[PDB]
Amino acid sequence: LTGTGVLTESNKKFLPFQQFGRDIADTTDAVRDPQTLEILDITPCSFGGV
Amino acid sequence: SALGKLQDVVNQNAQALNTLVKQLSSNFGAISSVLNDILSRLDPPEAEV
Amino acid sequence: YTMSLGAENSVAYSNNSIAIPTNFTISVTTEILPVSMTKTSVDCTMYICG
Amino acid sequence: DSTECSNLLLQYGSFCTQLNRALTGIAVEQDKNTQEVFAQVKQIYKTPPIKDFGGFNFSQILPDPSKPSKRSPIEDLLFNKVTNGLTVLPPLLTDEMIAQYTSALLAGTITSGWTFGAGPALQIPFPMQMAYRFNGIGVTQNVLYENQKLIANQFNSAIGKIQDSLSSTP
Amino acid sequence: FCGKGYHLMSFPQSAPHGVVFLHVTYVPAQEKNFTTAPAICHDGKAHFPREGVFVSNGTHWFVTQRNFYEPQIITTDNTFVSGNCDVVIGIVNNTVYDP
Numbered sequence: 155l156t157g158t159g160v161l162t163e164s165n166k167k168f169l170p171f172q173q174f175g176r177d178i179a180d181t182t183d184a185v186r187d188p189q190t191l192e193i194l195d196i197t198p199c200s201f202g203g204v
Numbered sequence: 205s206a207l208g209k210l211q212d213v214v215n216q217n218a219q220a221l222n223t224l225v226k227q228l229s230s231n232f233g234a235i236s237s238v239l240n241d242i243l244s245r246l247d248p249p250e251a252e253v
Numbered sequence: 254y255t256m257s258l259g260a261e262n263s264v265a266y267s268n269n270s271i272a273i274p275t276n277f278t279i280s281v282t283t284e285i286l287p288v289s290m291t292k293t294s295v296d297c298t299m300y301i302c303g
Numbered sequence: 304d305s306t307e308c309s310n311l312l313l314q315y316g317s318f319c320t321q322l323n324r325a326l327t328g329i330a331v332e333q334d335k336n337t338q339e340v341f342a343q344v345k346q347i348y349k350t351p352p353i354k355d356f357g358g359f360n361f362s363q364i365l366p367d368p369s370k371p372s373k374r375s376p377i378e379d380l381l382f383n384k385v386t387n388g389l390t391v392l393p394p395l396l397t398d399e400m401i402a403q404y405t406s407a408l409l410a411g412t413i414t415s416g417w418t419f420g421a422g423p424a425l426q427i428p429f430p431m432q433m434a435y436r437f438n439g440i441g442v443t444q445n446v447l448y449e450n451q452k453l454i455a456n457q458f459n460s461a462i463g464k465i466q467d468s469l470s471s472t473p
Numbered sequence: 474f475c476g477k478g479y480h481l482m483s484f485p486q487s488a489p490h491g492v493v494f495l496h497v498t499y500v501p502a503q504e505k506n507f508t509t510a511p512a513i514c515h516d517g518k519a520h521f522p523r524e525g526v527f528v529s530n531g532t533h534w535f536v537t538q539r540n541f542y543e544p545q546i547i548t549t550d551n552t553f554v555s556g557n558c559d560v561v562i563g564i565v566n567n568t569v570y571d572p
């Protein structure tokens with residue numbers, strides 16, 4: 155699973171089966187890292203109009 | 205329901221934005237709706253298609 | 254049901270009678286008119302391609 | 304009815320929902336337009352059975368009791384002169400109720416002046432209503448009263464010429 | 474255009490992406506029947522109201538403003554003379570007071 159974003163700590167209480175999370179657009183918003191099983195939130199990097 | 209004329213405009217604009225965001229989830233006949241999946245799965249001659 | 258258009262009123266017309274008001278009501282009514290929308294801008298390249 | 308076509312059409316998402324919603328908005332907008340145009344009165348007025356309006360003739364614009372559609376002769380001529388997933392929704396107001404609304408508006412503006420549009424319908428004789436309208440355009444009441452027969456004859460002749468011009472122009 | 478009734482004034486109010494107009498209007502109420510005439514015949518002359526309308530409560534004739542009942546004595550100050558009584562259809566006989 156590929157993508158770009160800032161990985162931060164999260165407070166979303168994922169259930170044991172649950173691995174990733176999806177927004178309305180279906181783009182991945184949170185992910186569970188292998189090897190260490192922790193839950194990393196994925197926040198898109200800051201952008202806007204010049 | 206006194207202020208329905210303004211709420212109608214707000215709901216129409218929010219629904220248009222939600223539809224435009226929702227349209228990214230459609231693959232439109234492709235193998236996937238995610239561009240990164242296509243770019244990581246296929247060679248550029250068929251990933252171009 | 255078949256909807257009614259209004260309460261039926263028959264105006265007491267005759268060729269030499271008039272109706273003159275003897276009192277009045279100061280009536281305040283609301284009229285709601287939209288003026289503007291939310292100003293939305295879409296980055297076309299980022300929306301199509303990211 | 305092709306199921307493979309609909310399975311391929313589900314790949315394009317909610318295009319059909321947007322088209323149906325836009326057409327539904329147009330369909331309710333037409334009923335809103337008719338509601339705003341014709342339903343400007345909440346009282347259904349009737350003319351008196353005796354049509355004594357000081358020589359003024361409204362038979363070409365008042366509803367004809369002999370016709371089952373309850374239309375005016377002018378309105379009857381107007382209605383005579385107009386000739387795969389597709390559905391046509393009927394309008395919310397039928398032509399009989401639109402004719403009833405126009406009949407109520409005509410009865411209000413004949414029997415009550417402009418008073419029914421601003422409040423309760425206050426009755427007034429039609430040669431007095433006409434004099435008030437004459438004073439609205441800056442002509443004295445006496446001019447209307449002295450020449451009331453000529454104005455009534457001119458009005459009846461003009462209404463007949465309107466019916467003749469509508470019947471003679473395609 | 475500015476509410477139902479005779480428009481007096483209006484107040485604007487801001488609203489989210491909109492405007493709200495408070496239309497203050499005048500609505501007539503408590504109407505009463507009166508017997509009316511187009512003109513008053515007096516001394517062989519026809520008298521017409523300058524701004525009002527001739528009304529009668531049954532025995533006496535008055536002139537009042539059109540949108541509010543305020544009966545006043547039919548005088549020369551509030552009437553004007555045009556022609557004789559032979560032309561106007563529905564002219565009635567009543568005295569016209571001279572101040």
Ligand SMILES: *[C@@H]1O[C@H](CO)[C@@H](O[C@@H]2O[C@H](CO)[C@@H](O)[C@H](O)[C@H]2NC(C)=O)[C@H](O)[C@H]1NC(C)=O
Binds near residue numbers: 272
């Ligand atoms: C003015 O007089 C007319 C007739 O004298 C009144 O009209 C009548 O009103 C009553 C009350 O609703 C009805 O039952 C009658 O059928 C009406 N008759 C006609 C011929 O319309 C009218 O109400 C009077 N106006 C006022 C303000 O009192």
Ligand SMILES: *[C@@H]1O[C@H](CO)[C@@H](O[C@@H]2O[C@H](CO)[C@@H](O)[C@H](O)[C@H]2NC(C)=O)[C@H](O)[C@H]1NC(C)=O
Binds near residue numbers: 276278
């Ligand atoms: C004109 O109408 C007003 C109300 O719109 C009348 O005022 C009311 O009069 C009654 C009895 O006199 C009182 O009990 C109410 O409290 C009054 N209401 C208000 C808001 O003041 C007024 O009397 C009427 N005048 C005429 C001449 O009919």
Ligand SMILES: *[C@@H]1O[C@H](CO)[C@@H](O[C@@H]2O[C@H](CO)[C@@H](O)[C@H](O)[C@H]2NC(C)=O)[C@H](O)[C@H]1NC(C)=O
Binds near residue numbers: 360361362
């Ligand atoms: C008002 O106008 C109508 C039609 O414009 C008149 O009705 C006509 O009457 C004459 C003789 O009475 C007939 O020969 C015509 O055939 C009638 N025309 C129609 C269309 O029916 C009516 O007489 C006029 N006056 C009144 C008081 O109603």
Ligand SMILES: *[C@@H]1O[C@H](CO)[C@@H](O[C@@H]2O[C@H](CO)[C@@H](O)[C@H](O)[C@H]2NC(C)=O)[C@H](O)[C@H]1NC(C)=O
Binds near residue numbers: 530531532533
């Ligand atoms: C019509 O109005 C006039 C004037 O307002 C009334 O005449 C007055 O009536 C009162 C009541 O009896 C008397 O006290 C006055 O003396 C009368 N004035 C004059 C100049 O005579 C008249 O009664 C009213 N008529 C009706 C049927 O209401």
Ligand SMILES: *[C@@H]1O[C@H](CO)[C@@H](O[C@@H]2O[C@H](CO)[C@@H](O)[C@H](O)[C@H]2NC(C)=O)[C@H](O)[C@H]1NC(C)=O
Binds near residue numbers: 514565566
């Ligand atoms: C109004 O007054 C006029 C004049 O005072 C009346 O006309 C008179 O009527 C009588 C009988 O009808 C005749 O003998 C006179 O010759 C007429 N005089 C004039 C100058 O025309 C008229 O009848 C009165 N109308 C009412 C309704 O009372």
Ligand SMILES: *[C@@H]1O[C@H](CO)[C@@H](O)[C@H](O)[C@H]1NC(C)=O
Binds near residue numbers: 188189190
């Ligand atoms: C390796 O991944 C597994 C999950 O499949 C995990 O249980 C284990 O702790 C991981 N070990 C190390 C050394 O990361």
Ligand SMILES: *[C@@H]1O[C@H](CO)[C@@H](O)[C@H](O)[C@H]1NC(C)=O
Binds near residue numbers: 268269562563
């Ligand atoms: C009003 O009609 C009556 C008949 O109902 C008649 O006697 C009277 O002269 C008419 N008045 C006017 C001003 O036309």
